[PDB]
Design a protein around this nucleic acid. Structure first.
Length: 848
RNA sequence: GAUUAUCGGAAGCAGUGCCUUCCAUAAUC
């Protein structure tokens, strides 16, 4: 079967059917030292080794990471599953449908056509009910394709964790969960042992057609984490520390793997945050190997104990269960950067500028100094004798002593950083501790809570903290006269204590001449203390309403406590609710899709019209026309654009043909299901620079005519007349964001070959995928260098026993001949070429 | 003008949010 079969063994001898490839018996001297991520890549490559899509030397390369990491070599990564967000999967599902159709047309069980891996269509208005119904049809019709519908009261990330597997138990195997997504938050799951990241519809679709993600074997930076943090330090402090640090270290385009005792101190939430912020510091992924915390957490989500213990069982079996408290398991990372948690210092910001940072234990000092100095960001010249002023006042029939640098406003609000919930919970437990200690927040202080929407809801509801928060006046959501007076009259510098990184300048009160940003717990604490002028280490927070003294340390809750509660109640409640919702949402046959011609969004593609089940030998492109003559860096959006449709476009006209108004046009993206619209929108980008026109215009010159018209129509009459079409380009052709149709389009137009000096990786692969020929000039040649005008008829001589990366001959109607590099880089791509599309190849492969 | 939108683009980091600002593109009023 597969050359590494000798490595597969029952995970449990009783169940000889359920097997696993034991990498320990592959070369423990090297394997035992690999990073766990590389271990995942390895496992997947090994397990999927088939002498074609994944060859032996690939396994050898991955395995020989410690050396191959430095040779910048491309290995295959074959993920366990795939995530398609919202309607990004439409093109895919459509493709597979059309495939089933073709296979039926050629006589063969269509129910063979299926995504190689599990596929999840996740969703967050009557416009798209059609598409939804379509995707649902997909979920019904396809094997291992689940759909999560809208109306699920549950939050995307939470959903992704819900769809987490960690260890696949399936097809009689045990393997590590790994994925790729047309999704924003994908990488977050790497906070939980699952390895994966974001890609484009085309890559995802390849992974769905079992084509492995070709990828340069990444270096791995080891982030070692040790030491205990100072109690006032919070998840946000830590996460931010790590993120900035990593931003400094320059891990761009490599893997970041975490290790060291300290990792134990990072909750899955923390790890997930840290992991999802990775595209900041550019890391391709940030791996947090599966451990005891991960397992416990997995139990806490309400997973099946048995399958959890199973997961652990296989992880230890295959050697991918982590013991951070055991340096003698540590991989030999490319580089090691460290972090001592007693380095992170709790810092507030102010008193006039967010960027003006200040330690928690230098508050009294820094403030008194700011009183010292004169008008400025870190000063408010108050006569050095007024420095101890203090005016009294009356609030609802009671007297208080408002003094310099007292706190008038105390506002806790969300922080965009996804480590908010834990910190909020922290504030909560602090409040609670303070209520227990019998402390209060003096009535006059303008106190407020605004945690925002999302997961924090669970962190607040399920810990039962809201009461304690509200008791200190911190309920969920113009200050007192006596305060205004006492302030202005007393000539006091008033302090506003805030929590939240959003719009600081836009919520500085006028009566307050000083404003500080802090962590919510710290907010509550300062609001309790009354005045920021205080060192919590010497001066107590307050005297009980029963005598004894209480300091901040006494009520401040430890990360251990916070995590404890989070784990015991929050996670359970949350996921209970998630299961309930999932359940009550699903309640809201035909194995071939019936297309509605009255449709505008979903149509069957041409692709496999006349698709024979016999091979189609190398077809020599004889005397073809240069459709487009483009410059350097023609982008994906240039090739197949996004955004709304203009009224002067072939798209808008084909739409106009069908009683459609510019209002009910929608965007090119929402028409990704229509080869018509998409093919008509190809190269229809206003900013398109065609050298045939020396101006920015989505048009070309139909040589036999001299008429300059829209590319779709030009190519239309071209292909009607039956003219082979090629495209000329320059450097980094195809660069840019993901555009599903950047190949399908040019394919449908009639482009048989593109010719450039320099291609973009993904794009070339995609072209080869659709079966378009990618041609590359020789080193030091190009359009002008060879004097090509684009006005010639082109003959591309294609040999019979064509081999990869080979030089092939281009000759002109003008007798002008020259060599070009045919960019089929492997026998796989030569195959895809000879079949004329990975789709075709898969169809033929399944119809047998 | 406002508003809304995009398989849009660029930038920004109290600090990475599918946030904010700007640009393009369109539709609604």
């Amino acid at each position: 079967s597969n050359p590494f079969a000798y490595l597969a063994e029952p995970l449990d001898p009783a169940q000889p059917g359920k097997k696993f490839f034991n990498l320990n018996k592959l070369d423990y001297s090297r394997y035992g030292r690999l990073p766990f991520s590389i271990r995942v890549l390895l496992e997947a490559a090994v397990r999927n080794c088939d002498k074609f899509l994944v060859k032996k030397e690939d396994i050898e390369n991955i395995l020989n990471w410690n050396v191959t990491q430095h040779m910048n070599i491309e290995v295959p990564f074959k993920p366990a599953r795939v995530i398609l967000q919202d309607f990004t999967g439409v093109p895919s599902v459509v493709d597979f449908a059309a495939m089933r159709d073709a296979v039926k047309k050629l006589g063969g069980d269509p129910e063979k056509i299926n995504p190689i891996c599990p596929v999840d269509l996740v969703i967050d208005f009557e416009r798209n009910r059609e598409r939804f119904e379509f995707l649902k049809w997909g979920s019904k019709a396809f094997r291992n394709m689940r759909i999560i519908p809208p109306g699920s009261g549950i939050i995307h990330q939470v959903n992704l964790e819900y769809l987490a597997r960690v260890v696949f138990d399936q097809d009689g195997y045990y393997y590590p969960d790994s994925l790729v997504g047309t999704d924003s938050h994908t990488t977050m799951i790497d906070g939980l042992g699952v390895l994966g990241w974001g890609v484009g519809g085309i890559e995802a679709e390849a992974v769905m057609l079992g084509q492995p993600i070709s990828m340069v074997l990444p270096q791995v930076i080891g982030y070692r984490l040790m030491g205990k943090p100072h109690p006032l330090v919070t998840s946000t402090d830590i996460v931010l520390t790590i993120t900035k640090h990593l931003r400094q270290v320059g891990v761009v385009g490599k893997f970041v793997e975490f290790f060291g005792p300290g990792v134990a101190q990072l909750s899955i939430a923390d790890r997930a945050t840290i992991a999802n912020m990775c595209p900041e510091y550019g890391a391709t992924a940030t791996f947090f190997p599966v451990d005891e915390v991960s397992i416990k957490y997995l139990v806490q989500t309400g997973r099946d104990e048995s399958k959890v213990k199973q997961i652990r069982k296989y992880l230890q079996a295959v050697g991918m269960f982590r013991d951070y408290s055991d340096p003698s398991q540590d991989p030999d990372f490319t580089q090691v950067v460290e972090l001592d948690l007693k380095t992170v210092v709790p810092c507030c910001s102010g008193p006039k500028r967010p960027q003006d940072k200040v330690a928690v234990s230098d508050m009294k000092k820094d403030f008194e100094s700011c009183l010292g100095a004169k008008q400025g960001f870190k000063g408010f010249q108050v006569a050095p004798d007024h420095h101890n002023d203090h005016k009294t006042f009356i609030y609802n029939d009671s007297e208080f002593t408002l003094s310099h640098g007292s706190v008038v406003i105390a506002a806790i609000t969300s922080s965009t950083n996804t480590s908010n919930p834990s910190v909020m919970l922290g504030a909560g437990l602090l409040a609670k501790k303070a209520v227990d200690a019998g402390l209060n927040v003096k009535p006059y202080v303008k106190t407020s809570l605004s945690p925002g929407s999302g997961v924090v809801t669970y962190y607040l509801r399920e810990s039962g903290v809201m009461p304690y928060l509200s008791q200190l006046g911190f309920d969920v959501v113009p200050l007192p006269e006596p305060v205004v007076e006492a302030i202005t009259q007393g000539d006091l510098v008033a302090v506003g204590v805030l929590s939240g990184n959003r719009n600081f300048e836009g919520r500085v009160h006028p009566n307050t001449r000083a404003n500080y940003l802090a962590s919510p717990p710290l907010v509550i604490a300062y609001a309790i203390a009354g005045t920021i002028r205080i060192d919590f280490e010497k001066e107590p927070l307050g005297t009980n309403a029963k005598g004894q003294q209480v300091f901040l340390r006494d009520i401040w809750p430890t990360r251990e406590e916070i995590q404890a509660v989070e784990r015991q109640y929050v996670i359970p409640g949350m996921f209970t609710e998630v299961y309930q919702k999932i359940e009550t949402v699903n309640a809201s046959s035909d194995k071939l899709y019936l297309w509605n011609p009255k449709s505008t969004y979903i149509k069957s593609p041409p692709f496999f019209e006349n698709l024979t089940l016999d091979l189609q030998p190398p077809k020599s492109i004889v005397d073809a026309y240069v459709l487009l003559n483009l410059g350097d860096s023609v982008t994906t959006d240039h090739i197949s654009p996004a955004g709304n449709i203009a009224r002067n476009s072939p798209a808008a006209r084909y739409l106009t043909n069908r009683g459609l108004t510019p209002r009910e046009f929608n965007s090119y993206g929402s028409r990704r299901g229509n080869d018509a619209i998409m093919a008509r929108g190809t190269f229809a980008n206003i900013r398109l620079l065609n050298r045939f026109l020396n101006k920015q215009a989505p048009q070309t010159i139909h040589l036999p005519s001299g008429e300059t018209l829209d590319v779709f129509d030009a190519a239309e009459r071209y292909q009607q007349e039956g003219h082979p079409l090629i495209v000329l380009a320059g450097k980094e052709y195809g660069s840019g964001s993901s555009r599903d149709w950047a190949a399908k389009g040019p394919f449908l137009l009639g482009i048989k070959a593109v010719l450039a000096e320099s291609y973009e990786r993904i794009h070339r692969s995609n072209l080869v995928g659709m079966g378009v020929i990618p041609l590359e000039y020789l080193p030091g040649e190009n359009a002008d260098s060879l004097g090509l005008t684009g006005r010639e008829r082109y003959t591309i001589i294609i040999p019979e026993n064509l081999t990869p990366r080979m030089h092939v001959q281009v000759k002109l109607d003008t007798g002008k001949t020259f060599q070009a590099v045919i960019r089929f880089d492997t026998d796989v791509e030569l195959t895809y070429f000879h079949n004329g599309g990975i789709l075709n190849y898969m169809i033929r492969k399944m119809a047998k």
